[PDB]
Amino acid sequence: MSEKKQPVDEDNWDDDNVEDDFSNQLRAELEKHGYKMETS
Amino acid sequence: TPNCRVALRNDSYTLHKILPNKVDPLVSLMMVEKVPDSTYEMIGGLDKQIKEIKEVIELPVKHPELFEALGIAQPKGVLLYGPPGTGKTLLARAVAHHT
Amino acid sequence: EFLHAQEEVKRIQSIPLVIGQFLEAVDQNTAIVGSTTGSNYYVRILSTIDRELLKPNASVALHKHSNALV
Amino acid sequence: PKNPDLRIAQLRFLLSLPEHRGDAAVRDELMAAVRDNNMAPYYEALCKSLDWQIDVDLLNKMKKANEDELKRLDEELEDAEKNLGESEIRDAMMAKAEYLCRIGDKEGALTAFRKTYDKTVALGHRLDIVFYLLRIGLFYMDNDLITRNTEKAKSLIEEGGDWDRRNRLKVYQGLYCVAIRDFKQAAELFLDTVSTFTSYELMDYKTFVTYTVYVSMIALERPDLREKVIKGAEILEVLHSLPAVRQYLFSLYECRYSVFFQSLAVVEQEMKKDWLFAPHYRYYVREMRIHAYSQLLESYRSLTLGYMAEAFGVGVEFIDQELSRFIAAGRLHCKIDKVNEIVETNRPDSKNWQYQETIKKGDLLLNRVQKLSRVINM
Amino acid sequence: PPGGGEQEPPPPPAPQDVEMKEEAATGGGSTGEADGKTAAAAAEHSQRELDTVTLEDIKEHVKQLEKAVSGKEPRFVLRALRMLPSTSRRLNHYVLYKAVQGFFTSNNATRDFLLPFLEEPMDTEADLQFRPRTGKAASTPLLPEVEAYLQLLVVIFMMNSKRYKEAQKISDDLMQKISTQNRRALDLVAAKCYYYHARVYEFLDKLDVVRSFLHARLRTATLRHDADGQATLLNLLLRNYLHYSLYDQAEKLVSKSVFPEQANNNEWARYLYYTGRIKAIQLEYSEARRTMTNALRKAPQHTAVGFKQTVHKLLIVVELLLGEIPDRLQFRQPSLKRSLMPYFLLTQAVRTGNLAKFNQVLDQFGEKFQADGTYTLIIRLRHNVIKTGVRMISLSYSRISLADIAQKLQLDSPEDAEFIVAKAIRDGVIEASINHEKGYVQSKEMIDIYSTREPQLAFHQRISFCLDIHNMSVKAMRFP
Amino acid sequence: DKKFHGILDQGEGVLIIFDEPPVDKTYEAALETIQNMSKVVDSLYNKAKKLT
Amino acid sequence: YLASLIRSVVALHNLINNKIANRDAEKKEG
Ligand SMILES: Nc1ncnc2c1ncn2[C@@H]1O[C@H](COP(=O)(O)OP(=O)(O)O)[C@@H](O)[C@H]1O
Question: Any remaining note in the record (chain G)?
């Protein structure tokens, strides 16, 4: 058994969707709000 | 077994088949009276009387040899007394339940 | 053909019908009833009755002569 | 004992995952690690620690004291069987295996708890043993062993009332349903906050108040927040000592939208450093943003997008890119316009969105049973 | 001699313990029950031969001092194996060579002594008509020569051993192949030696005159037997025709050999994958993903499965080409996690609308994709990035300027920002119009999609499908 | 607070009032069966997948 | 669509009810 003729050689899913949205977008979005008050 | 039901044909009254297990009359007796089945876990604050009642009843069943080493007759009768409503029935029901 | 024989079996459910009471069953498709003549009986059943309408303490019909479950 | 045992699991989280913050956490845990006879649960924590080169006599003075308690059990087991009580070998170490549960690993616990489970004829010791198995199964996150004994717990409470074993139990699923991302259960298991006692795991009752309010603002809408957690005297006076969380809850209720994001930045920062919310802190606010957006947006129809800068949150382009990704996410029912600078809403019926979740589950169960019937029967 | 004489003397007999029970039970069975009475459609000797390939894959590693396998060959090759009264002495000869390893020293086969280990089918009335013996008596030495492959002046010893098996293979193709399963049980011995016939040749030799011999092997296949001869001779036909530019793909479309109808659950499983990549490589997208999925859920329960590390990568290459994406790390492993992180970072760029985010991947991992041999499908995702984005923007913004969408897609030009939207409508992504005089692209709001016929088409696919599995539960039940 | 339902306008104050009990009974009381039946197929693993 | 979905699961539970009576008698009876 287990031959496989070789030609070549929750906890996990919801956050992966949440990793997809803010992948490179405002990770520690905490301190821009302190700087957005005097600008906007 | 003695005191067991059976089936029975009627033309010749030949024995047919064992009909199971009806009741012991002792089982029906306590079923009529319905004592409040208890345990040590519902005993409120009687720790020294539990130690007294085990010496006379609990020990001469599990260890009958332990009195032959002392060579005395094993006890037979226990008197429980006090004002009513203090747990005479539940303590006696507890000891018979746990051995 | 099975549906024709399915309905044929209820000719035993005719009119001179007596009344017992369910007590228990030994096994599949055979039970123990108690008639209203005082004597209990070990009877065969009829197959088409839904078995899951039995024993709180069920009123049952019994055959007149053969005195089986009906 | 297992009663101070959950703070250890929080401080292990406090040790490893804040990477710069790993100096005082490795000291105050070692303040409790190499005392109270703990041997097993910190070898790889010592591997995540520094060298600590001489721990050998530090272990030898403790594994001896482990053996000392273990050998007086070995001196108990023959004096209890000679003149028997209710199997007083087992009955002694049915309280001393929880020591061995803390000291050793689960194996000394599990073979002794299932030993003493069959001893006691009343559940009043059995159901307290089951609370021990639940608590270690949280430490080692035994997500498949908690499913067994929780039913075996709940099957015991029906005989008797056992409300100090039911209301105690509801906190455990309430911490388990918030361990998993299941918030409509966690607020429902935290529904009482009345019989919830000054426990061991949330030793402040007010920390339990913070956990039951952070999940309650997600799970239910506002016919129920405006009756339950604004009018409960059991819940008002305990955050009456809290300036932030009183302001954090009421800013959504009072429609003080600008200061809502201010304290939300504090909580989401706090939710990151907190244990057991850090698996899902990025899931929290993106649900709380879209909860905050749609509440304002479903009152009006012809709202301009530049009205939300000075009254809801500053940065017009910040509003722009954030609403752009949520309508594209398939939620937040409105339709933003761009070059006349207005946000128009719609109202879709409760059929298509109710239809959309049905076609998800219908594919998923058909994925389950088609894959099953290939595996079985060759 | 003490470090030898306690660690070297147990490697001879304990393999001799298990080799008197596995291929001696195969030699005790498959000479008398494959050349003998029968080994039917429900046979055991094929699965017994499946048990004597896998065990010896990871059994032998060492160059065999103390003759622990180097003495097995002068044992196992002096075999007539004709009938029981002449093998009752050979049942002693399984033990007579054991003291040859022990009392004396045998001939230690270390890379030179395989030439007097192959010329034996003349010695003491051996035959080749009993090819249920001799095809196995080829493969019982033909495997462990080539199992390690050892690639140092050995290849000719592997070759001449195959040549004697190729002489058995021509007697298979011509002489009395009927109802003894002389083709059937040796189509496996054909198929299993082909992978040792290939990794010799895929290492240092050519590839293509074997293909015409394989056409001559495919010639007699389905021409005497239509069971496991149509199957393994076509994956082993395809295995370098995909990697070559020879015609070989529209041939396999109109070929009748597509269905052997049964191929023993593991060669059938990858069979739908080698032709699953053929539709992938020649632009047949939507047909491919169902024979890619069907090639996944028919594989067994091993862990070191590096071809399965490729099919899970390739199955959602073509689904990025179609738009749908599942969670790929839903069965992530310690050996899958490292084989996903460059490729999982690719589909991160696809679910976004950024344009040169594709370029930030294709320079970072442009070399990794050419190692897996998949780059030619990767290069065309920019058509699917821009159709994902134009669906994303048109559904979000209703009335957006065409001189704003290009700056968000970093297109660097508004003058063709009209033009992708033209091909977005020509393909049919978005419906609504463009005010080319003004510059805004307005979109109509969606209407009652509930009272359209199309959710019944989500049903009618699945009404008829769910009645099939209820029928298949009936058809597969009453075997008793 | 959903004690009344409608919409408010900002330009001139127009309250478009509408009402429909949409449907609730047909779908979500049929949706929860699916997740009940999912747990039945999960419980099939404890008498088939372990067993044969 | 719900009622047909139920029909597939019920006969699948019947399928194991024949795989309980196939494998657990060939070693017992023969
Ligand atoms: N010490 C006690 N602990 C717990 N329950 C008690 C105790 N004493 C009496 N009860 C209650 O009294 C009832 C039993 O009556 P009991 O006191 O045994 O009658 P008696 O007067 O014969 O002792 C039980 O229902 C029990 O709940």
Answer: Does not bind a metal ion.
Find where tokens 């496996």 sit: E188
Same-domain check for residues E391 and E451: no
Residue B91 CA to ligand 1 center (angstroms) comes to 8
Q: Do E312 and E380 share a domain, yes or no?
A: yes
Torsion of the alpha carbons at E199, E203, E204 and E206, rounded to the nearest 10? 60
* CA separation, residue E103 to residues E6, E96, E97, E99 (Å): 16, 11, 10, 5
Tokens representing E17 are: 């313990």
Statement to judge: residues E392 and E461 lie in one domain: no
Claim to verify: residue E396 and residue E281 sit in the same structural domain: yes
Contacting subunits of G (3+ beta carbon pairs below 8 A): D, E, F
Any idea what DSSP says for residue C43? E
Nearest to E169 by CA among E201, E194, E203: E194
Return the exposure string of E318-353: e unless at least 16 CB atoms fall within 10 Å of the residue's CB, then b. bbbbeeeeeebbeeeeeebeebbeebbebbebbebb
How buried is residue E30: exposed, middle or buried, by Cβ count under 10 Å (0-12/13-18/19+)? buried
Give residue for tokens 């065309």. Answer: E380
Residue B60: both structure tokens together: 């001469």
E458 & E360 share domain: no
Q: What are E417's two structure tokens?
A: 């920002």
Region of residue D138 (phi > 0: left; psi between -120 and 50: alpha; otherwise: beta): alpha
What one-character DSSP code corresponds to residue E328?
Answer: G
> Residue E106 in contact with residue E100, Cβ under 8 Å?
yes
- Residues E134, D19: Cα–Cα separation, whole Å: 67
Tokens 């040749």 belong to residue: E201
Q: Which of E391, E389, E366, E388 is nearest to E379 (CA)?
A: E366
Same domain, E282 and E392: yes
CB contact under 8 A, A4 and E302: yes
How do beta strands C59-62 and C40-44 pair? unpaired
Q: Which residues contact C64 (CB under 8 A, 6 or more apart)?
A: C16, C17, C18
Residue among G9, E286, E316, E217 nearest D373 (CA): G9
Structure tokens at B36: 């409040």
Q: Is B64 annotated as a binding residue?
A: no
Q: What is the resolution of this structure in A?
A: 3.2
Q: Which two tokens stand for residue D343?
A: 């946000």
E389 and E334 within one domain: yes
Residue B82: Cβ-neighbour burial (10 angstroms; 0-12, 13-18, 19+): exposed
Question: Closest Cα to residue E441, out of E417, E416, E423?
Answer: E417
Q: For residues G22 and G26, what is the distance between their CA atoms, to the nearest angstrom?
A: 7
Contact state of A5 with E330 under an 8 Å Cβ cutoff: no
- Annotated binding-site residue? B82: yes
Query: What is the residue whose two structure tokens read 């339902």?
Result: F5
The DSSP H or E segment spanning D344 is strand D343-345
Please give the method by which this entry was determined.
cryo-EM
Residue E122 is encoded by which pair of tokens? 């003349």
Ligand 1 atom with minimal separation from the B43 CA = 3
Q: Which amino acid is at E228?
A: D
Are residues E367 and E288 both part of a single domain? Answer: yes
Cβ distance D60 to B38 under 8 Å? no
Instruction: Report how far residue F7's alpha carbon sits from residue F13's, in angstroms, rounded to the nearest whole number.
Output: 10
CB within 8 Å: D265 and A15: no
Q: Which two tokens stand for residue D2?
A: 């297992």
B71 is in an annotated binding site: no
Measure the CA–CA gap between E437 and E445, rounded to whole angstroms: 22
In eight-state DSSP terms, residue E226 is: -
CA distance D299 to D255: 12
Please write down the HEC assignment for all residues of E408-427. Answer: HCCCCCCCCHHHHHHHHHHH
Question: Does A20 lie at the interface with D, CB-CB under 8 angstroms?
Answer: no
Query: Which chain D residues are within 8 Å of F34, Cβ to Cβ?
Result: 358, 361-362, 365
Range of the domain at E384: 273-402
> CA E134 → CA A13, B57, E186, E227, distances in Å?
55, 83, 10, 21
